[PDB]
């Protein structure tokens, strides 16, 4: 069978494996981990890696592995299952799901009318002590990688230095949401699905929160694309290509619509969970996935004192 380095969620991917194996008989072994962990591990393994497939929550760790020259071209028929805007132009990997940046806020701490117009506005001195984020996570680092691609090094580093003055750090994006929910800060920068996931359980970590979408092609409207790819070293290329085709195809994208992950489908003509605000109404900035640079992001955040 095939070996998948999986930095996407264990439960979502297991439902993909369930349908994929049922229809093809191809068995899948998951090696689960985080974006940056598994990305760096693949670069170190190089062509000696036992992985056939790499899946990520966000794009920068895909770019890391592609920069190392480790991905095989994806089948053209697979690439055509996803629109070009949710896909690197070079076709060596593909988007498999999406997540929207949001400002999660506590209405008892901050009225909707007081929310920042731009993610860049959180650098202003009036925001000191009033917002949070998880800078060690690949989630927030991907958001900063979009700001870097959109705004450039100097403007991004200036924003990061003001964030060091202004923000409150927490370990984990769900932790940020819990802190907002408890009223420790006015709000925080996370991805949209965390609130949906918790509301589908007890809601005890989210009931005092609401989601704000920056829109207007703001850096804060960045839509982060989860990635999938076939390793060039794979000895099971047909099976590996078929797994990517499955997860980006109608049945695989269907799971995104009906499961409890609340992440967006990216497939052509694919409906997303109806509780989500449609991606086409969010007016995300144009951000080429290959332009997202996780190494420079870590350096800038370290220069700012955040890591
Ligand atoms: Fe995440």
PDB file of C-alpha atoms and ligand atoms in Angstrom:
ATOM      1  CA  UNK A   1       0.000   0.000   0.000  1.00  0.00           C
ATOM      2  CA  UNK A   2       1.053   3.625   0.387  1.00  0.00           C
ATOM      3  CA  UNK A   3       2.612   5.671   3.175  1.00  0.00           C
ATOM      4  CA  UNK A   4       1.155   9.138   3.781  1.00  0.00           C
ATOM      5  CA  UNK A   5       2.945  11.783   5.840  1.00  0.00           C
ATOM      6  CA  UNK A   6      -0.166  13.481   7.173  1.00  0.00           C
ATOM      7  CA  UNK A   7      -0.124  16.946   8.712  1.00  0.00           C
ATOM      8  CA  UNK A   8      -3.823  17.383   7.988  1.00  0.00           C
ATOM      9  CA  UNK A   9      -6.270  16.315  10.710  1.00  0.00           C
ATOM     10  CA  UNK A  10      -6.252  12.639  11.666  1.00  0.00           C
ATOM     11  CA  UNK A  11     -10.038  12.297  11.602  1.00  0.00           C
ATOM     12  CA  UNK A  12     -10.617  14.002   8.250  1.00  0.00           C
ATOM     13  CA  UNK A  13      -7.871  11.971   6.578  1.00  0.00           C
ATOM     14  CA  UNK A  14      -9.093   8.663   8.019  1.00  0.00           C
ATOM     15  CA  UNK A  15     -12.487   9.247   6.405  1.00  0.00           C
ATOM     16  CA  UNK A  16     -10.674   9.840   3.109  1.00  0.00           C
ATOM     17  CA  UNK A  17      -8.730   6.601   3.593  1.00  0.00           C
ATOM     18  CA  UNK A  18     -11.982   4.777   4.431  1.00  0.00           C
ATOM     19  CA  UNK A  19     -13.617   5.618   1.109  1.00  0.00           C
ATOM     20  CA  UNK A  20     -10.381   5.352  -0.880  1.00  0.00           C
ATOM     21  CA  UNK A  21      -9.567   1.868   0.362  1.00  0.00           C
ATOM     22  CA  UNK A  22     -13.192   0.719   0.032  1.00  0.00           C
ATOM     23  CA  UNK A  23     -13.232   1.630  -3.659  1.00  0.00           C
ATOM     24  CA  UNK A  24      -9.651   0.754  -4.685  1.00  0.00           C
ATOM     25  CA  UNK A  25      -8.433  -1.796  -2.144  1.00  0.00           C
ATOM     26  CA  UNK A  26      -5.239   0.264  -1.777  1.00  0.00           C
ATOM     27  CA  UNK A  27      -4.164   0.243   1.865  1.00  0.00           C
ATOM     28  CA  UNK A  28      -2.851   3.433   3.447  1.00  0.00           C
ATOM     29  CA  UNK A  29      -0.466   3.829   6.378  1.00  0.00           C
ATOM     30  CA  UNK A  30      -0.679   7.245   8.053  1.00  0.00           C
ATOM     31  CA  UNK A  31       2.296   8.897   9.748  1.00  0.00           C
ATOM     32  CA  UNK A  32       0.601  11.827  11.500  1.00  0.00           C
ATOM     33  CA  UNK A  33       2.348  15.018  12.589  1.00  0.00           C
ATOM     34  CA  UNK A  34       2.488  18.793  12.221  1.00  0.00           C
ATOM     35  CA  UNK A  35       3.164  20.851   9.079  1.00  0.00           C
ATOM     36  CA  UNK A  36       6.662  22.032   9.918  1.00  0.00           C
ATOM     37  CA  UNK A  37       7.750  18.779  11.605  1.00  0.00           C
ATOM     38  CA  UNK A  38       6.864  16.592   8.606  1.00  0.00           C
ATOM     39  CA  UNK A  39       8.007  19.149   6.034  1.00  0.00           C
ATOM     40  CA  UNK A  40      11.464  19.415   7.592  1.00  0.00           C
ATOM     41  CA  UNK A  41      11.619  15.627   8.019  1.00  0.00           C
ATOM     42  CA  UNK A  42      10.949  15.084   4.314  1.00  0.00           C
ATOM     43  CA  UNK A  43      13.689  17.567   3.352  1.00  0.00           C
ATOM     44  CA  UNK A  44      16.135  15.663   5.562  1.00  0.00           C
ATOM     45  CA  UNK A  45      15.056  12.236   4.281  1.00  0.00           C
ATOM     46  CA  UNK A  46      15.221  13.449   0.682  1.00  0.00           C
ATOM     47  CA  UNK A  47      14.882  10.649  -1.853  1.00  0.00           C
ATOM     48  CA  UNK A  48      15.404   8.134   0.978  1.00  0.00           C
ATOM     49  CA  UNK A  49      11.982   8.923   2.450  1.00  0.00           C
ATOM     50  CA  UNK A  50       9.471   6.058   2.808  1.00  0.00           C
ATOM     51  CA  UNK A  51       6.630   8.517   2.151  1.00  0.00           C
ATOM     52  CA  UNK A  52       4.518   8.241  -0.981  1.00  0.00           C
ATOM     53  CA  UNK A  53       2.269  11.240  -0.246  1.00  0.00           C
ATOM     54  CA  UNK A  54       2.504  14.437   1.828  1.00  0.00           C
ATOM     55  CA  UNK A  55      -0.586  16.278   3.128  1.00  0.00           C
ATOM     56  CA  UNK A  56      -0.538  19.601   5.031  1.00  0.00           C
ATOM     57  CA  UNK A  57      -2.874  21.978   6.840  1.00  0.00           C
ATOM     58  CA  UNK A  58      -1.291  25.006   5.148  1.00  0.00           C
ATOM     59  CA  UNK A  59       0.752  25.752   2.046  1.00  0.00           C
ATOM     60  CA  UNK A  60       4.222  26.966   3.249  1.00  0.00           C
ATOM     61  CA  UNK A  61       5.317  23.453   4.283  1.00  0.00           C
ATOM     62  CA  UNK A  62       4.360  22.248   0.795  1.00  0.00           C
ATOM     63  CA  UNK A  63       6.550  24.960  -0.725  1.00  0.00           C
ATOM     64  CA  UNK A  64       9.418  23.813   1.496  1.00  0.00           C
ATOM     65  CA  UNK A  65       9.247  20.283   0.104  1.00  0.00           C
ATOM     66  CA  UNK A  66       8.753  21.510  -3.449  1.00  0.00           C
ATOM     67  CA  UNK A  67      11.791  23.806  -3.125  1.00  0.00           C
ATOM     68  CA  UNK A  68      13.738  20.657  -2.172  1.00  0.00           C
ATOM     69  CA  UNK A  69      12.690  19.132  -5.538  1.00  0.00           C
ATOM     70  CA  UNK A  70      10.883  16.196  -3.902  1.00  0.00           C
ATOM     71  CA  UNK A  71       7.449  16.241  -5.598  1.00  0.00           C
ATOM     72  CA  UNK A  72       6.390  14.444  -8.755  1.00  0.00           C
ATOM     73  CA  UNK A  73       4.183  16.185 -11.326  1.00  0.00           C
ATOM     74  CA  UNK A  74       0.534  15.459 -10.577  1.00  0.00           C
ATOM     75  CA  UNK A  75      -1.637  13.875 -13.272  1.00  0.00           C
ATOM     76  CA  UNK A  76      -3.311  16.511 -15.451  1.00  0.00           C
ATOM     77  CA  UNK A  77      -6.700  14.911 -14.780  1.00  0.00           C
ATOM     78  CA  UNK A  78      -6.088  15.351 -11.048  1.00  0.00           C
ATOM     79  CA  UNK A  79      -5.078  19.018 -11.406  1.00  0.00           C
ATOM     80  CA  UNK A  80      -8.272  19.738 -13.350  1.00  0.00           C
ATOM     81  CA  UNK A  81     -10.351  18.701 -10.295  1.00  0.00           C
ATOM     82  CA  UNK A  82      -9.365  21.945  -8.496  1.00  0.00           C
ATOM     83  CA  UNK A  83      -9.504  25.543  -9.840  1.00  0.00           C
ATOM     84  CA  UNK A  84      -6.194  27.236 -10.614  1.00  0.00           C
ATOM     85  CA  UNK A  85      -6.576  29.676  -7.732  1.00  0.00           C
ATOM     86  CA  UNK A  86      -6.434  26.818  -5.165  1.00  0.00           C
ATOM     87  CA  UNK A  87      -3.388  25.228  -6.790  1.00  0.00           C
ATOM     88  CA  UNK A  88       0.261  26.152  -7.511  1.00  0.00           C
ATOM     89  CA  UNK A  89       0.732  26.963 -11.177  1.00  0.00           C
ATOM     90  CA  UNK A  90       3.532  24.398 -11.637  1.00  0.00           C
ATOM     91  CA  UNK A  91       1.258  21.422 -10.898  1.00  0.00           C
ATOM     92  CA  UNK A  92       3.673  19.586  -8.565  1.00  0.00           C
ATOM     93  CA  UNK A  93       1.140  19.744  -5.701  1.00  0.00           C
ATOM     94  CA  UNK A  94      -2.542  20.609  -5.297  1.00  0.00           C
ATOM     95  CA  UNK A  95      -4.908  22.188  -2.821  1.00  0.00           C
ATOM     96  CA  UNK A  96      -7.143  19.721  -0.996  1.00  0.00           C
ATOM     97  CA  UNK A  97      -9.105  21.974   1.452  1.00  0.00           C
ATOM     98  CA  UNK A  98      -9.128  25.599   2.557  1.00  0.00           C
ATOM     99  CA  UNK A  99      -9.457  27.686   5.731  1.00  0.00           C
ATOM    100  CA  UNK A 100     -10.147  31.415   6.127  1.00  0.00           C
ATOM    101  CA  UNK A 101      -8.277  33.798   8.394  1.00  0.00           C
ATOM    102  CA  UNK A 102     -10.672  35.453  10.859  1.00  0.00           C
ATOM    103  CA  UNK A 103     -10.578  37.826  13.801  1.00  0.00           C
ATOM    104  CA  UNK A 104     -12.323  35.920  16.582  1.00  0.00           C
ATOM    105  CA  UNK A 105     -13.687  38.457  19.071  1.00  0.00           C
ATOM    106  CA  UNK A 106     -15.706  38.629  22.285  1.00  0.00           C
ATOM    107  CA  UNK A 107     -18.692  41.004  21.881  1.00  0.00           C
ATOM    108  CA  UNK A 108     -18.706  41.639  25.634  1.00  0.00           C
ATOM    109  CA  UNK A 109     -15.148  42.977  25.325  1.00  0.00           C
ATOM    110  CA  UNK A 110     -15.376  44.705  21.929  1.00  0.00           C
ATOM    111  CA  UNK A 111     -18.364  45.737  19.852  1.00  0.00           C
ATOM    112  CA  UNK A 112     -18.493  44.701  16.212  1.00  0.00           C
ATOM    113  CA  UNK A 113     -18.392  48.401  15.304  1.00  0.00           C
ATOM    114  CA  UNK A 114     -14.943  48.647  16.963  1.00  0.00           C
ATOM    115  CA  UNK A 115     -13.288  45.804  15.025  1.00  0.00           C
ATOM    116  CA  UNK A 116     -10.155  46.631  13.003  1.00  0.00           C
ATOM    117  CA  UNK A 117     -10.723  47.382   9.324  1.00  0.00           C
ATOM    118  CA  UNK A 118      -7.397  45.767   8.382  1.00  0.00           C
ATOM    119  CA  UNK A 119      -5.129  43.165   9.890  1.00  0.00           C
ATOM    120  CA  UNK A 120      -2.439  45.842   9.499  1.00  0.00           C
ATOM    121  CA  UNK A 121      -4.335  48.028  11.988  1.00  0.00           C
ATOM    122  CA  UNK A 122      -3.517  45.691  14.901  1.00  0.00           C
ATOM    123  CA  UNK A 123      -0.028  47.268  14.857  1.00  0.00           C
ATOM    124  CA  UNK A 124      -1.476  50.602  16.000  1.00  0.00           C
ATOM    125  CA  UNK A 125      -0.765  51.641  19.611  1.00  0.00           C
ATOM    126  CA  UNK A 126      -4.483  51.609  20.428  1.00  0.00           C
ATOM    127  CA  UNK A 127      -4.424  47.803  20.066  1.00  0.00           C
ATOM    128  CA  UNK A 128      -1.756  47.225  22.745  1.00  0.00           C
ATOM    129  CA  UNK A 129      -2.746  44.324  24.999  1.00  0.00           C
ATOM    130  CA  UNK A 130      -6.021  43.715  23.162  1.00  0.00           C
ATOM    131  CA  UNK A 131      -5.394  40.782  20.801  1.00  0.00           C
ATOM    132  CA  UNK A 132      -3.797  37.325  20.755  1.00  0.00           C
ATOM    133  CA  UNK A 133      -2.301  34.712  18.446  1.00  0.00           C
ATOM    134  CA  UNK A 134      -0.287  31.480  18.530  1.00  0.00           C
ATOM    135  CA  UNK A 135       2.983  32.456  16.813  1.00  0.00           C
ATOM    136  CA  UNK A 136       4.584  28.998  17.141  1.00  0.00           C
ATOM    137  CA  UNK A 137       1.912  27.347  14.977  1.00  0.00           C
ATOM    138  CA  UNK A 138       2.051  26.742  11.252  1.00  0.00           C
ATOM    139  CA  UNK A 139      -1.419  28.318  11.048  1.00  0.00           C
ATOM    140  CA  UNK A 140      -0.348  31.809  12.058  1.00  0.00           C
ATOM    141  CA  UNK A 141       2.984  31.483  10.291  1.00  0.00           C
ATOM    142  CA  UNK A 142       1.101  30.879   7.039  1.00  0.00           C
ATOM    143  CA  UNK A 143      -0.885  34.070   7.645  1.00  0.00           C
ATOM    144  CA  UNK A 144       2.398  35.966   8.115  1.00  0.00           C
ATOM    145  CA  UNK A 145       3.753  34.325   4.939  1.00  0.00           C
ATOM    146  CA  UNK A 146       0.820  35.827   3.016  1.00  0.00           C
ATOM    147  CA  UNK A 147       1.498  39.256   4.533  1.00  0.00           C
ATOM    148  CA  UNK A 148       5.134  38.886   3.478  1.00  0.00           C
ATOM    149  CA  UNK A 149       4.102  37.947  -0.066  1.00  0.00           C
ATOM    150  CA  UNK A 150       1.617  40.825  -0.206  1.00  0.00           C
ATOM    151  CA  UNK A 151       3.386  43.599   1.684  1.00  0.00           C
ATOM    152  CA  UNK A 152       7.103  42.774   1.503  1.00  0.00           C
ATOM    153  CA  UNK A 153       9.834  42.248   4.060  1.00  0.00           C
ATOM    154  CA  UNK A 154      10.102  45.700   5.636  1.00  0.00           C
ATOM    155  CA  UNK A 155       6.369  46.340   6.017  1.00  0.00           C
ATOM    156  CA  UNK A 156       5.913  42.825   7.413  1.00  0.00           C
ATOM    157  CA  UNK A 157       8.763  43.134   9.913  1.00  0.00           C
ATOM    158  CA  UNK A 158       7.382  46.502  11.057  1.00  0.00           C
ATOM    159  CA  UNK A 159       4.012  44.817  11.687  1.00  0.00           C
ATOM    160  CA  UNK A 160       5.672  41.918  13.545  1.00  0.00           C
ATOM    161  CA  UNK A 161       7.596  44.302  15.815  1.00  0.00           C
ATOM    162  CA  UNK A 162       4.366  46.100  16.725  1.00  0.00           C
ATOM    163  CA  UNK A 163       2.731  42.723  17.325  1.00  0.00           C
ATOM    164  CA  UNK A 164       5.489  41.964  19.853  1.00  0.00           C
ATOM    165  CA  UNK A 165       4.538  45.166  21.686  1.00  0.00           C
ATOM    166  CA  UNK A 166       0.788  44.643  21.327  1.00  0.00           C
ATOM    167  CA  UNK A 167      -0.285  41.006  21.270  1.00  0.00           C
ATOM    168  CA  UNK A 168      -0.703  38.336  23.937  1.00  0.00           C
ATOM    169  CA  UNK A 169       0.754  34.944  23.034  1.00  0.00           C
ATOM    170  CA  UNK A 170      -0.940  31.613  23.702  1.00  0.00           C
ATOM    171  CA  UNK A 171       0.171  28.072  22.857  1.00  0.00           C
ATOM    172  CA  UNK A 172      -2.346  26.758  20.318  1.00  0.00           C
ATOM    173  CA  UNK A 173      -5.055  28.315  18.152  1.00  0.00           C
ATOM    174  CA  UNK A 174      -7.822  26.628  20.153  1.00  0.00           C
ATOM    175  CA  UNK A 175      -6.168  28.120  23.240  1.00  0.00           C
ATOM    176  CA  UNK A 176      -6.364  31.597  21.646  1.00  0.00           C
ATOM    177  CA  UNK A 177     -10.077  31.021  21.039  1.00  0.00           C
ATOM    178  CA  UNK A 178     -10.565  29.921  24.670  1.00  0.00           C
ATOM    179  CA  UNK A 179      -8.810  33.081  25.925  1.00  0.00           C
ATOM    180  CA  UNK A 180     -11.021  35.282  23.756  1.00  0.00           C
ATOM    181  CA  UNK A 181     -14.059  33.310  24.934  1.00  0.00           C
ATOM    182  CA  UNK A 182     -13.023  33.950  28.563  1.00  0.00           C
ATOM    183  CA  UNK A 183     -12.544  37.673  27.937  1.00  0.00           C
ATOM    184  CA  UNK A 184      -8.789  37.848  28.572  1.00  0.00           C
ATOM    185  CA  UNK A 185      -8.327  39.888  25.356  1.00  0.00           C
ATOM    186  CA  UNK A 186     -10.712  41.510  22.894  1.00  0.00           C
ATOM    187  CA  UNK A 187      -9.944  39.068  20.109  1.00  0.00           C
ATOM    188  CA  UNK A 188      -7.417  36.991  18.228  1.00  0.00           C
ATOM    189  CA  UNK A 189      -6.092  35.939  14.840  1.00  0.00           C
ATOM    190  CA  UNK A 190      -6.950  32.310  14.016  1.00  0.00           C
ATOM    191  CA  UNK A 191      -8.677  30.308  11.255  1.00  0.00           C
ATOM    192  CA  UNK A 192     -12.445  30.101  10.877  1.00  0.00           C
ATOM    193  CA  UNK A 193     -13.085  26.415  11.599  1.00  0.00           C
ATOM    194  CA  UNK A 194     -12.060  26.367  15.274  1.00  0.00           C
ATOM    195  CA  UNK A 195     -15.286  28.061  16.399  1.00  0.00           C
ATOM    196  CA  UNK A 196     -17.403  25.828  14.156  1.00  0.00           C
ATOM    197  CA  UNK A 197     -15.740  22.683  15.517  1.00  0.00           C
ATOM    198  CA  UNK A 198     -16.277  23.672  19.144  1.00  0.00           C
ATOM    199  CA  UNK A 199     -19.851  24.857  18.550  1.00  0.00           C
ATOM    200  CA  UNK A 200     -20.590  21.414  17.084  1.00  0.00           C
ATOM    201  CA  UNK A 201     -19.505  19.842  20.392  1.00  0.00           C
ATOM    202  CA  UNK A 202     -20.413  21.568  23.651  1.00  0.00           C
ATOM    203  CA  UNK A 203     -19.777  25.159  22.615  1.00  0.00           C
ATOM    204  CA  UNK A 204     -18.229  25.754  26.036  1.00  0.00           C
ATOM    205  CA  UNK A 205     -15.034  27.174  24.495  1.00  0.00           C
ATOM    206  CA  UNK A 206     -16.758  29.369  21.906  1.00  0.00           C
ATOM    207  CA  UNK A 207     -20.198  30.575  23.057  1.00  0.00           C
ATOM    208  CA  UNK A 208     -18.960  34.067  23.977  1.00  0.00           C
ATOM    209  CA  UNK A 209     -17.173  34.527  20.626  1.00  0.00           C
ATOM    210  CA  UNK A 210     -18.118  35.621  17.125  1.00  0.00           C
ATOM    211  CA  UNK A 211     -16.145  35.620  13.877  1.00  0.00           C
ATOM    212  CA  UNK A 212     -15.137  38.718  11.908  1.00  0.00           C
ATOM    213  CA  UNK A 213     -13.958  38.483   8.293  1.00  0.00           C
ATOM    214  CA  UNK A 214     -11.654  41.264   7.090  1.00  0.00           C
ATOM    215  CA  UNK A 215     -12.583  40.924   3.382  1.00  0.00           C
ATOM    216  CA  UNK A 216     -11.495  43.597   0.841  1.00  0.00           C
ATOM    217  CA  UNK A 217      -8.433  41.548  -0.230  1.00  0.00           C
ATOM    218  CA  UNK A 218      -6.840  42.427   3.117  1.00  0.00           C
ATOM    219  CA  UNK A 219      -3.934  40.356   4.445  1.00  0.00           C
ATOM    220  CA  UNK A 220      -6.431  39.391   7.164  1.00  0.00           C
ATOM    221  CA  UNK A 221      -8.667  37.862   4.462  1.00  0.00           C
ATOM    222  CA  UNK A 222      -5.960  35.358   3.502  1.00  0.00           C
ATOM    223  CA  UNK A 223      -7.422  31.962   2.652  1.00  0.00           C
ATOM    224  CA  UNK A 224      -4.850  29.296   3.508  1.00  0.00           C
ATOM    225  CA  UNK A 225      -4.786  26.226   1.254  1.00  0.00           C
ATOM    226  CA  UNK A 226      -4.125  22.742   2.599  1.00  0.00           C
ATOM    227  CA  UNK A 227      -1.750  20.857   0.306  1.00  0.00           C
ATOM    228  CA  UNK A 228      -1.353  17.396  -1.156  1.00  0.00           C
ATOM    229  CA  UNK A 229       1.463  15.879  -3.200  1.00  0.00           C
ATOM    230  CA  UNK A 230       3.122  12.693  -4.436  1.00  0.00           C
ATOM    231  CA  UNK A 231       6.793  12.172  -3.572  1.00  0.00           C
ATOM    232  CA  UNK A 232       9.086  11.724  -6.582  1.00  0.00           C
ATOM    233  CA  UNK A 233      10.853   8.855  -4.749  1.00  0.00           C
ATOM    234  CA  UNK A 234       7.603   6.896  -4.366  1.00  0.00           C
ATOM    235  CA  UNK A 235       7.748   3.307  -5.593  1.00  0.00           C
ATOM    236  CA  UNK A 236       3.907   3.259  -5.734  1.00  0.00           C
ATOM    237  CA  UNK A 237       3.292   6.161  -8.105  1.00  0.00           C
ATOM    238  CA  UNK A 238      -0.005   4.974  -9.626  1.00  0.00           C
ATOM    239  CA  UNK A 239      -1.465   4.285  -6.179  1.00  0.00           C
ATOM    240  CA  UNK A 240      -0.140   7.596  -4.831  1.00  0.00           C
ATOM    241  CA  UNK A 241      -1.577   9.592  -7.736  1.00  0.00           C
ATOM    242  CA  UNK A 242      -4.896   7.790  -7.219  1.00  0.00           C
ATOM    243  CA  UNK A 243      -5.058   8.805  -3.559  1.00  0.00           C
ATOM    244  CA  UNK A 244      -4.567  12.492  -4.451  1.00  0.00           C
ATOM    245  CA  UNK A 245      -7.154  12.181  -7.236  1.00  0.00           C
ATOM    246  CA  UNK A 246      -9.552  10.616  -4.731  1.00  0.00           C
ATOM    247  CA  UNK A 247      -9.208  13.261  -2.027  1.00  0.00           C
ATOM    248  CA  UNK A 248      -9.606  16.128  -4.543  1.00  0.00           C
ATOM    249  CA  UNK A 249     -12.369  14.339  -6.469  1.00  0.00           C
ATOM    250  CA  UNK A 250     -16.096  14.499  -5.919  1.00  0.00           C
ATOM    251  CA  UNK A 251     -16.301  11.916  -3.135  1.00  0.00           C
ATOM    252  CA  UNK A 252     -13.250  13.211  -1.272  1.00  0.00           C
ATOM    253  CA  UNK A 253     -14.426  16.815  -1.473  1.00  0.00           C
ATOM    254  CA  UNK A 254     -17.908  15.623  -0.456  1.00  0.00           C
ATOM    255  CA  UNK A 255     -16.480  14.544   2.895  1.00  0.00           C
ATOM    256  CA  UNK A 256     -15.447  18.151   3.536  1.00  0.00           C
ATOM    257  CA  UNK A 257     -19.058  19.267   3.045  1.00  0.00           C
ATOM    258  CA  UNK A 258     -20.621  16.785   5.512  1.00  0.00           C
ATOM    259  CA  UNK A 259     -17.998  15.999   8.195  1.00  0.00           C
ATOM    260  CA  UNK A 260     -17.378  17.944  11.425  1.00  0.00           C
ATOM    261  CA  UNK A 261     -14.105  19.580  10.342  1.00  0.00           C
ATOM    262  CA  UNK A 262     -15.819  22.659   8.856  1.00  0.00           C
ATOM    263  CA  UNK A 263     -12.983  23.319   6.420  1.00  0.00           C
ATOM    264  CA  UNK A 264     -13.791  24.458   2.899  1.00  0.00           C
ATOM    265  CA  UNK A 265     -13.863  22.265  -0.179  1.00  0.00           C
ATOM    266  CA  UNK A 266     -11.639  23.452  -3.021  1.00  0.00           C
ATOM    267  CA  UNK A 267     -12.840  21.144  -5.798  1.00  0.00           C
ATOM    268  CA  UNK A 268     -14.446  22.435  -8.970  1.00  0.00           C
ATOM    269  CA  UNK A 269     -18.216  22.687  -8.470  1.00  0.00           C
ATOM    270  CA  UNK A 270     -17.870  21.356  -4.890  1.00  0.00           C
ATOM    271  CA  UNK A 271     -20.296  22.668  -2.279  1.00  0.00           C
ATOM    272  CA  UNK A 272     -18.935  23.465   1.180  1.00  0.00           C
ATOM    273  CA  UNK A 273     -20.632  23.018   4.554  1.00  0.00           C
ATOM    274  CA  UNK A 274     -23.694  25.339   4.440  1.00  0.00           C
ATOM    275  CA  UNK A 275     -22.872  26.904   7.815  1.00  0.00           C
ATOM    276  CA  UNK A 276     -19.712  28.439   6.301  1.00  0.00           C
ATOM    277  CA  UNK A 277     -19.589  31.822   4.622  1.00  0.00           C
ATOM    278  CA  UNK A 278     -18.883  31.051   0.941  1.00  0.00           C
ATOM    279  CA  UNK A 279     -15.258  31.709  -0.023  1.00  0.00           C
ATOM    280  CA  UNK A 280     -16.424  33.807  -2.974  1.00  0.00           C
ATOM    281  CA  UNK A 281     -18.041  36.271  -0.557  1.00  0.00           C
ATOM    282  CA  UNK A 282     -14.861  36.695   1.499  1.00  0.00           C
ATOM    283  CA  UNK A 283     -12.863  38.505  -1.231  1.00  0.00           C
ATOM    284  CA  UNK A 284      -9.537  36.950  -0.280  1.00  0.00           C
ATOM    285  CA  UNK A 285      -6.322  38.536  -1.582  1.00  0.00           C
ATOM    286  CA  UNK A 286      -4.601  36.984  -4.571  1.00  0.00           C
ATOM    287  CA  UNK A 287      -1.713  35.017  -3.041  1.00  0.00           C
ATOM    288  CA  UNK A 288       0.167  32.548  -5.220  1.00  0.00           C
ATOM    289  CA  UNK A 289       0.791  29.492  -2.979  1.00  0.00           C
ATOM    290  CA  UNK A 290       4.396  29.098  -4.175  1.00  0.00           C
ATOM    291  CA  UNK A 291       5.219  32.617  -2.996  1.00  0.00           C
ATOM    292  CA  UNK A 292       4.756  31.591   0.668  1.00  0.00           C
ATOM    293  CA  UNK A 293       8.171  31.397   2.361  1.00  0.00           C
ATOM    294  CA  UNK A 294       8.167  29.690   5.764  1.00  0.00           C
ATOM    295  CA  UNK A 295      11.910  30.118   6.349  1.00  0.00           C
ATOM    296  CA  UNK A 296      11.920  33.903   5.909  1.00  0.00           C
ATOM    297  CA  UNK A 297       8.802  34.116   8.084  1.00  0.00           C
ATOM    298  CA  UNK A 298      10.512  32.354  11.007  1.00  0.00           C
ATOM    299  CA  UNK A 299      13.530  34.654  10.647  1.00  0.00           C
ATOM    300  CA  UNK A 300      11.370  37.786  10.607  1.00  0.00           C
ATOM    301  CA  UNK A 301       9.355  36.650  13.639  1.00  0.00           C
ATOM    302  CA  UNK A 302      12.588  35.845  15.480  1.00  0.00           C
ATOM    303  CA  UNK A 303      13.992  39.269  14.580  1.00  0.00           C
ATOM    304  CA  UNK A 304      10.784  40.713  16.051  1.00  0.00           C
ATOM    305  CA  UNK A 305      11.212  38.663  19.244  1.00  0.00           C
ATOM    306  CA  UNK A 306       8.135  36.502  18.653  1.00  0.00           C
ATOM    307  CA  UNK A 307       9.933  33.141  18.467  1.00  0.00           C
TER     308      UNK A 307
HETATM  309 FE1  LIG B   1      -4.492  24.394  12.391  1.00  0.00          FE
END
